[PDB]
Short mmCIF file of C-alpha atoms and ligand atoms in Angstrom, two decimals:
data_model
loop_
_atom_site.label_atom_id
_atom_site.label_comp_id
_atom_site.label_asym_id
_atom_site.label_seq_id
_atom_site.Cartn_x
_atom_site.Cartn_y
_atom_site.Cartn_z
CA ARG A 5 34.36 -98.90 -23.33
CA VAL A 6 35.07 -99.85 -27.04
CA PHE A 7 36.70 -103.32 -28.05
CA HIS A 8 37.65 -103.86 -31.31
CA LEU A 9 38.01 -107.68 -32.33
CA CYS A 10 39.18 -109.17 -35.55
CA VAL A 11 37.89 -112.60 -35.71
CA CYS A 12 39.28 -113.74 -39.08
CA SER A 13 36.96 -115.35 -41.63
CA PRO A 14 35.85 -117.91 -41.70
CA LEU A 15 35.69 -118.13 -37.93
CA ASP A 16 33.27 -114.69 -37.99
CA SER A 17 30.54 -117.60 -39.04
CA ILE A 18 30.56 -119.32 -36.02
CA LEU A 19 32.25 -117.11 -33.09
CA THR A 20 31.35 -113.71 -34.17
CA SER A 21 27.85 -114.01 -33.16
CA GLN A 22 28.83 -116.01 -30.08
CA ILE A 23 31.06 -113.19 -28.87
CA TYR A 24 28.59 -110.23 -29.57
CA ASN A 25 25.71 -111.89 -28.18
CA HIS A 26 26.96 -112.83 -24.98
CA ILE A 27 28.60 -109.46 -24.49
CA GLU A 28 25.55 -107.66 -25.56
CA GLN A 29 23.80 -109.69 -22.58
CA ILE A 30 26.11 -109.47 -19.85
CA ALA A 31 27.64 -106.09 -20.57
CA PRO A 32 25.30 -104.08 -22.32
CA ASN A 33 27.39 -100.95 -21.69
CA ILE A 34 30.54 -102.34 -23.81
CA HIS A 35 30.72 -101.85 -27.39
CA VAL A 36 32.33 -104.63 -29.41
CA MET A 37 33.39 -103.68 -33.04
CA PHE A 38 34.11 -106.74 -35.34
CA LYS A 39 36.45 -107.12 -38.74
CA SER A 40 37.20 -110.29 -40.39
CA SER A 41 40.38 -109.74 -41.70
CA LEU A 42 43.66 -108.07 -40.33
CA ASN A 43 44.85 -105.05 -41.95
CA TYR A 52 43.98 -98.74 -30.96
CA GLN A 53 46.29 -101.52 -29.89
CA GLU A 54 45.16 -101.98 -26.19
CA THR A 55 41.52 -102.45 -27.16
CA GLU A 56 42.43 -104.94 -29.85
CA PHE A 57 41.82 -108.92 -30.01
CA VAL A 58 42.32 -111.27 -32.97
CA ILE A 59 40.97 -114.62 -33.29
CA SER A 60 42.28 -116.44 -36.30
CA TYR A 61 43.95 -119.68 -37.46
CA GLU A 62 47.08 -117.77 -38.15
CA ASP A 63 49.62 -116.30 -35.53
CA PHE A 64 50.27 -113.05 -36.95
CA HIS A 65 53.33 -112.27 -34.65
CA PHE A 69 50.77 -109.28 -29.12
CA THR A 70 50.27 -112.45 -27.21
CA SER A 71 49.25 -115.96 -28.75
CA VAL A 72 47.08 -118.43 -26.97
CA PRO A 73 46.37 -121.75 -28.82
CA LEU A 74 42.61 -122.45 -28.33
CA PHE A 75 41.26 -125.36 -30.12
CA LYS A 76 42.12 -127.41 -33.63
CA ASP A 77 39.57 -127.65 -36.30
CA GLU A 78 39.52 -130.64 -38.71
CA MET A 79 39.64 -129.43 -42.28
CA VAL A 80 37.71 -131.52 -44.68
CA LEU A 81 37.01 -131.56 -48.72
CA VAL A 82 33.57 -130.69 -49.65
CA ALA A 83 31.63 -131.29 -53.05
CA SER A 84 28.46 -131.29 -54.34
CA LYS A 85 26.39 -134.06 -53.19
CA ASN A 86 25.37 -135.27 -56.49
CA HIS A 87 28.75 -134.73 -57.93
CA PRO A 88 29.31 -137.13 -61.52
CA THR A 89 32.28 -138.78 -60.11
CA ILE A 90 32.96 -138.11 -56.32
CA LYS A 91 31.39 -140.59 -54.48
CA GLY A 92 33.61 -141.18 -51.38
CA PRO A 93 36.68 -140.45 -50.07
CA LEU A 94 39.59 -139.44 -52.54
CA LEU A 95 43.43 -140.62 -52.32
CA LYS A 96 45.55 -137.87 -51.59
CA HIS A 97 46.99 -137.96 -55.47
CA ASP A 98 43.38 -137.40 -56.68
CA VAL A 99 42.73 -134.15 -54.69
CA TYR A 100 44.13 -131.79 -57.27
CA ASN A 101 43.24 -133.63 -60.33
CA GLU A 102 39.87 -131.88 -59.26
CA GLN A 103 38.36 -128.43 -60.29
CA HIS A 104 39.14 -126.15 -56.98
CA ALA A 105 37.21 -123.32 -55.60
CA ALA A 106 39.18 -121.43 -53.14
CA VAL A 107 39.31 -118.25 -51.30
CA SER A 108 41.48 -115.50 -52.99
CA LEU A 109 45.02 -116.51 -52.80
CA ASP A 110 45.92 -112.74 -52.99
CA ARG A 111 44.33 -111.74 -50.02
CA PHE A 112 46.62 -111.17 -46.82
CA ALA A 113 46.34 -114.38 -44.67
CA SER A 114 43.82 -116.02 -47.14
CA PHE A 115 42.23 -118.95 -45.46
CA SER A 116 42.99 -121.15 -48.38
CA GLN A 117 46.73 -120.46 -48.72
CA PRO A 118 48.25 -123.55 -47.20
CA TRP A 119 46.57 -125.73 -49.86
CA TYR A 120 47.68 -123.98 -53.02
CA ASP A 121 51.21 -123.02 -52.33
CA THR A 122 52.57 -124.42 -55.56
CA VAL A 123 51.76 -123.85 -59.49
CA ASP A 124 50.59 -127.43 -59.86
CA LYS A 125 47.76 -126.80 -57.13
CA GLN A 126 47.04 -123.21 -57.99
CA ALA A 127 46.48 -124.59 -61.55
CA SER A 128 43.42 -126.82 -60.18
CA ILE A 129 41.70 -123.75 -59.17
CA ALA A 130 38.61 -122.44 -61.34
CA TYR A 131 37.15 -120.11 -58.90
CA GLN A 132 38.35 -117.51 -56.14
CA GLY A 133 36.00 -116.28 -53.96
CA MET A 134 36.09 -113.63 -51.42
CA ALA A 135 34.98 -116.00 -48.50
CA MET A 136 34.72 -119.56 -47.69
CA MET A 137 30.94 -119.22 -47.47
CA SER A 138 30.69 -117.80 -51.00
CA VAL A 139 33.12 -120.81 -51.73
CA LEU A 140 30.54 -123.19 -50.64
CA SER A 141 27.67 -121.74 -52.62
CA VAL A 142 29.77 -122.35 -55.77
CA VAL A 143 30.68 -126.14 -55.01
CA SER A 144 27.17 -126.63 -54.25
CA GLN A 145 26.38 -125.46 -57.60
CA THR A 146 28.97 -126.83 -59.64
CA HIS A 147 31.32 -129.83 -59.91
CA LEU A 148 33.99 -127.93 -58.09
CA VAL A 149 35.77 -129.05 -54.92
CA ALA A 150 36.93 -127.14 -51.68
CA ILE A 151 38.78 -127.48 -48.62
CA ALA A 152 36.90 -126.06 -45.79
CA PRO A 153 36.62 -126.61 -41.90
CA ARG A 154 34.37 -129.23 -40.85
CA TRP A 155 32.29 -127.27 -38.77
CA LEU A 156 31.53 -125.19 -41.44
CA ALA A 157 30.90 -127.92 -44.04
CA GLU A 158 28.69 -129.66 -41.64
CA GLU A 159 26.43 -126.48 -40.91
CA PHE A 160 25.68 -126.19 -44.62
CA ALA A 161 25.65 -129.57 -45.88
CA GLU A 162 21.88 -130.00 -45.68
CA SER A 163 21.08 -126.65 -47.19
CA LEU A 164 23.69 -126.52 -49.68
CA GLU A 165 23.44 -130.41 -50.42
CA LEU A 166 26.97 -130.98 -49.87
CA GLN A 167 28.98 -134.15 -49.35
CA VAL A 168 31.78 -133.85 -46.59
CA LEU A 169 34.80 -136.03 -47.03
CA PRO A 170 38.09 -136.37 -44.90
CA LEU A 171 40.99 -134.50 -46.43
CA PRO A 172 43.89 -136.79 -47.12
CA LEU A 173 46.32 -134.14 -47.12
CA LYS A 174 48.77 -133.84 -44.46
CA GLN A 175 47.61 -130.12 -43.39
CA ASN A 176 44.56 -131.63 -42.34
CA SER A 177 43.75 -129.32 -39.49
CA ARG A 178 44.31 -125.56 -38.61
CA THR A 179 44.98 -124.07 -34.97
CA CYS A 180 42.42 -121.22 -33.53
CA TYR A 181 44.68 -118.72 -31.78
CA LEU A 182 43.66 -115.74 -29.48
CA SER A 183 45.97 -112.81 -29.34
CA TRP A 184 46.18 -109.36 -27.70
CA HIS A 185 48.61 -106.45 -26.70
CA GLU A 186 50.44 -107.14 -23.91
CA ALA A 187 49.47 -105.56 -20.86
CA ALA A 188 51.32 -102.10 -20.95
CA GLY A 189 49.82 -101.65 -17.69
CA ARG A 190 47.20 -102.95 -15.41
CA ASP A 191 43.63 -103.06 -17.28
CA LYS A 192 40.84 -104.88 -15.51
CA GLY A 193 38.44 -104.45 -18.44
CA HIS A 194 41.18 -105.97 -20.58
CA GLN A 195 41.66 -108.85 -18.64
CA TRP A 196 37.78 -109.53 -18.30
CA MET A 197 37.59 -109.40 -21.82
CA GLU A 198 40.68 -111.71 -21.98
CA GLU A 199 39.01 -114.09 -19.82
CA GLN A 200 35.64 -113.46 -21.51
CA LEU A 201 37.08 -114.89 -24.94
CA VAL A 202 39.08 -117.76 -23.91
CA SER A 203 35.61 -119.24 -22.38
CA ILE A 204 33.70 -118.59 -25.25
CA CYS A 205 36.17 -119.71 -27.58
CA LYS A 206 36.58 -122.76 -25.46
CA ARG A 207 32.93 -123.55 -25.23
CA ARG B 5 41.30 -121.08 -74.89
CA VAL B 6 41.29 -119.41 -71.50
CA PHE B 7 38.91 -116.60 -70.40
CA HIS B 8 39.68 -114.83 -67.08
CA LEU B 9 36.51 -113.60 -65.97
CA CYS B 10 35.81 -111.34 -62.63
CA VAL B 11 32.13 -111.83 -61.27
CA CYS B 12 32.60 -109.61 -58.24
CA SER B 13 30.82 -110.61 -54.98
CA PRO B 14 27.97 -111.17 -54.48
CA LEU B 15 27.15 -112.15 -57.93
CA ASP B 16 29.51 -114.85 -57.82
CA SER B 17 26.69 -116.73 -55.72
CA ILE B 18 24.26 -116.85 -58.66
CA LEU B 19 26.07 -116.19 -61.77
CA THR B 20 29.34 -117.81 -61.64
CA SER B 21 27.95 -121.43 -61.27
CA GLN B 22 25.71 -120.35 -64.40
CA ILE B 23 28.47 -119.50 -66.57
CA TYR B 24 31.11 -122.11 -65.34
CA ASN B 25 28.26 -125.09 -65.82
CA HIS B 26 27.12 -123.58 -69.17
CA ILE B 27 30.40 -122.97 -70.92
CA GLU B 28 31.38 -126.67 -69.14
CA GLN B 29 28.62 -128.11 -71.17
CA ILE B 30 28.80 -126.47 -74.59
CA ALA B 31 32.43 -126.01 -74.58
CA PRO B 32 34.77 -128.36 -72.71
CA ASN B 33 37.95 -127.16 -74.53
CA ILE B 34 37.54 -123.70 -73.22
CA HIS B 35 39.03 -122.82 -70.26
CA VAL B 36 36.71 -120.32 -67.83
CA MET B 37 38.79 -119.25 -64.79
CA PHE B 38 37.16 -116.91 -62.19
CA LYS B 39 37.76 -114.16 -59.84
CA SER B 40 35.14 -112.47 -57.39
CA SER B 41 36.83 -108.89 -56.91
CA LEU B 42 38.87 -106.64 -59.25
CA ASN B 43 42.69 -105.98 -58.45
CA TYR B 52 45.55 -110.51 -69.72
CA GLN B 53 42.99 -108.08 -71.11
CA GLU B 54 41.67 -109.53 -74.52
CA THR B 55 40.71 -112.74 -72.32
CA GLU B 56 38.77 -110.68 -69.74
CA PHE B 57 35.06 -109.81 -68.68
CA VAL B 58 33.71 -108.33 -65.71
CA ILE B 59 30.47 -108.66 -64.46
CA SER B 60 29.57 -106.19 -61.51
CA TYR B 61 27.41 -103.72 -59.88
CA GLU B 62 30.08 -101.04 -60.59
CA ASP B 63 31.03 -99.60 -63.74
CA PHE B 64 34.78 -99.57 -63.17
CA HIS B 65 36.12 -97.32 -66.31
CA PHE B 69 37.03 -101.50 -71.89
CA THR B 70 33.17 -101.34 -72.65
CA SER B 71 30.30 -101.28 -70.32
CA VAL B 72 26.76 -103.08 -71.04
CA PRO B 73 23.80 -102.58 -68.60
CA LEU B 74 22.23 -105.77 -68.26
CA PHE B 75 19.43 -105.86 -65.34
CA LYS B 76 18.88 -103.74 -62.01
CA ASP B 77 18.41 -105.98 -58.77
CA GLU B 78 16.38 -104.63 -55.81
CA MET B 79 18.26 -104.24 -52.31
CA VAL B 80 16.47 -105.14 -49.12
CA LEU B 81 17.07 -105.00 -45.53
CA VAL B 82 17.38 -108.29 -43.89
CA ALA B 83 17.27 -109.37 -40.29
CA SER B 84 16.73 -112.50 -38.21
CA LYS B 85 13.01 -113.95 -38.50
CA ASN B 86 12.91 -113.71 -34.50
CA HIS B 87 14.06 -110.13 -34.10
CA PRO B 88 13.19 -108.62 -31.11
CA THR B 89 11.93 -105.35 -32.38
CA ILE B 90 11.85 -105.50 -36.10
CA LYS B 91 8.47 -106.85 -36.95
CA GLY B 92 8.04 -105.45 -40.38
CA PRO B 93 8.99 -102.27 -42.75
CA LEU B 94 11.04 -99.76 -41.27
CA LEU B 95 10.79 -95.86 -41.99
CA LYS B 96 13.78 -94.40 -43.36
CA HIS B 97 15.01 -92.65 -40.40
CA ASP B 98 14.69 -96.01 -38.52
CA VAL B 99 17.63 -97.71 -40.68
CA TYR B 100 20.54 -96.42 -38.94
CA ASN B 101 19.17 -96.63 -35.52
CA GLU B 102 19.71 -100.43 -35.89
CA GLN B 103 23.16 -102.10 -35.52
CA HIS B 104 24.56 -103.15 -39.01
CA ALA B 105 26.70 -106.01 -40.39
CA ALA B 106 28.22 -105.07 -43.93
CA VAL B 107 31.00 -105.78 -46.17
CA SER B 108 34.25 -104.53 -45.32
CA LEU B 109 34.21 -100.90 -46.23
CA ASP B 110 38.20 -100.80 -47.05
CA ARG B 111 37.65 -103.11 -49.91
CA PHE B 112 38.22 -101.78 -53.55
CA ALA B 113 34.42 -101.75 -54.75
CA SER B 114 32.98 -103.12 -51.61
CA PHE B 115 29.51 -103.95 -52.26
CA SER B 116 28.43 -102.04 -48.91
CA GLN B 117 30.17 -98.94 -49.73
CA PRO B 118 26.81 -96.92 -51.10
CA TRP B 119 25.04 -97.10 -47.90
CA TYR B 120 27.76 -96.39 -45.33
CA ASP B 121 29.20 -93.13 -46.67
CA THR B 122 28.88 -90.71 -43.87
CA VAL B 123 30.22 -91.06 -40.54
CA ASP B 124 26.91 -91.27 -38.95
CA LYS B 125 25.76 -94.59 -41.27
CA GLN B 126 29.18 -95.89 -40.52
CA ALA B 127 28.80 -95.67 -36.82
CA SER B 128 25.67 -98.07 -36.97
CA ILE B 129 27.94 -100.87 -38.25
CA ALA B 130 28.97 -103.37 -35.58
CA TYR B 131 30.30 -106.07 -37.76
CA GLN B 132 32.31 -105.91 -41.19
CA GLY B 133 32.58 -109.41 -43.04
CA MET B 134 34.47 -110.28 -46.40
CA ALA B 135 31.45 -111.18 -48.32
CA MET B 136 27.57 -110.80 -48.19
CA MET B 137 27.23 -114.67 -47.49
CA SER B 138 29.52 -114.04 -44.31
CA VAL B 139 27.19 -111.17 -43.68
CA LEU B 140 23.94 -113.17 -43.82
CA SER B 141 25.14 -115.89 -41.41
CA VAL B 142 25.90 -113.19 -38.85
CA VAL B 143 22.68 -111.40 -38.98
CA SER B 144 21.21 -115.04 -38.90
CA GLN B 145 22.57 -115.46 -35.75
CA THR B 146 22.41 -112.25 -33.98
CA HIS B 147 20.17 -108.68 -34.05
CA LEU B 148 22.23 -106.84 -36.53
CA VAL B 149 20.49 -105.81 -39.92
CA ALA B 150 21.84 -105.75 -43.26
CA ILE B 151 21.24 -104.51 -46.83
CA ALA B 152 21.65 -107.18 -49.53
CA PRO B 153 20.28 -108.21 -52.97
CA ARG B 154 16.81 -109.42 -52.58
CA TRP B 155 17.99 -112.49 -54.93
CA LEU B 156 20.54 -113.44 -52.38
CA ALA B 157 18.47 -112.93 -49.22
CA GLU B 158 15.55 -114.84 -50.51
CA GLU B 159 17.72 -117.73 -51.63
CA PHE B 160 18.92 -118.21 -47.85
CA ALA B 161 15.98 -116.67 -45.98
CA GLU B 162 14.44 -120.02 -44.98
CA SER B 163 17.75 -121.91 -44.20
CA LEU B 164 19.07 -118.63 -42.37
CA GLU B 165 15.73 -117.80 -40.95
CA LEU B 166 16.00 -114.22 -42.27
CA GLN B 167 12.98 -111.72 -42.93
CA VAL B 168 13.25 -109.80 -46.00
CA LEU B 169 11.99 -106.25 -46.05
CA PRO B 170 11.70 -103.55 -48.50
CA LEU B 171 14.83 -100.79 -48.06
CA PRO B 172 13.22 -97.49 -47.65
CA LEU B 173 16.50 -95.73 -48.78
CA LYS B 174 16.76 -93.60 -52.04
CA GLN B 175 19.51 -96.19 -53.13
CA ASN B 176 17.20 -99.32 -53.46
CA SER B 177 18.65 -100.98 -56.44
CA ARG B 178 22.18 -101.73 -57.90
CA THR B 179 22.72 -101.93 -61.77
CA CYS B 180 24.64 -105.12 -63.04
CA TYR B 181 27.08 -104.03 -66.00
CA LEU B 182 29.05 -106.49 -68.32
CA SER B 183 32.40 -105.29 -69.40
CA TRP B 184 35.15 -106.13 -71.46
CA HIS B 185 38.22 -104.84 -73.79
CA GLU B 186 37.35 -103.00 -76.55
CA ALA B 187 38.19 -105.05 -79.76
CA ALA B 188 41.71 -104.58 -80.82
CA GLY B 189 41.03 -106.57 -83.94
CA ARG B 190 38.53 -109.30 -84.91
CA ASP B 191 38.04 -112.22 -82.77
CA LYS B 192 35.40 -114.80 -82.87
CA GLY B 193 36.00 -116.56 -79.63
CA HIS B 194 36.05 -113.16 -77.81
CA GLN B 195 32.87 -112.09 -79.69
CA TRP B 196 31.22 -115.65 -78.83
CA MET B 197 31.85 -115.02 -75.01
CA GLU B 198 30.33 -111.80 -75.11
CA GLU B 199 27.37 -113.08 -76.78
CA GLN B 200 27.31 -115.83 -74.23
CA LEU B 201 27.67 -113.58 -70.93
CA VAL B 202 24.79 -111.41 -72.27
CA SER B 203 22.50 -114.28 -73.12
CA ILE B 204 23.47 -115.91 -69.48
CA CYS B 205 23.12 -112.64 -67.42
CA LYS B 206 19.93 -111.67 -69.29
CA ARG B 207 18.24 -115.13 -68.73
CL1 CL C 301 37.38 -117.42 -45.17
CL1 CL C 302 29.98 -109.30 -51.46
#
């Protein structure tokens, strides 16, 4: 059987491998296919920081942080809320449907702070590493790459300092043991 | 003055910072804005592995390689051409206009090898690092992240083993010293 999973970026950088590897081990017969952005229903599961409006299960909340180069010329510790958009920002392309960065660049003034739009947070962190730009990232992602990319990881002094991870699937249009098995697996893997 | 540069992924992971930093230093008055995918003309420059068909200057050729986890269970050295699509692949979303990965997944059989599509090669390498999937990447990118992502970097035994980097801009519809200055700067930075 084939399952088509959408694990929306940037969550594909932690959860896709966990899911792929676990199903590879316990059900080598089952073929899981992964995409990392949205856009056959009964084979579909979405894991995302959005609810796309299918079911919707909130799994966990992730802290979001501010990242900058370790050797930033002026940033040497936490910022005030008013300071944030006086920095130059790197973000994920705002034109992308459900872009990760959208919540924090929803006014002209905030958008004006952006000097670079990349295709994924992983690209964003590479540019932050190499420049004086700042970015807003999940703590887990920033902390994974802080050592190799020489990043400082700071609290985000904005009201929107978390995102909620949701698991979503097509409501049972009939009984389906394999589908229910995958529902249970994905909750377990995500909650772990 | 504002220049709008598109440095198409994955090249934004090496060239965007070089350009941003150099112009920041030598012309702090000039505002360079960056995007990393295509889709005001006289302020526009594109740097990409495509010619989008504006001028078109071929700058350099980059070797493309095969990447896999260092501790891959079966891959322990170079592959034969026929072996490549018998592995499970991670690639950049093929539906994206001018997706980096498109040249290598242009048949049903090749597409069938894909288990994961991500939004950028930087995301792809993170998943390769964590799984048994393989991917096709620029050598410079793979070699930058091989140590931290514990990757092996292998020659690509396919005919399409290089991509050409092009610089492209709007033909002079009138004389423009600032535009010509930026043309000269970008050739210099890219060729260096
Ligand atoms: Cl992302
Ligand atoms: Cl890419």
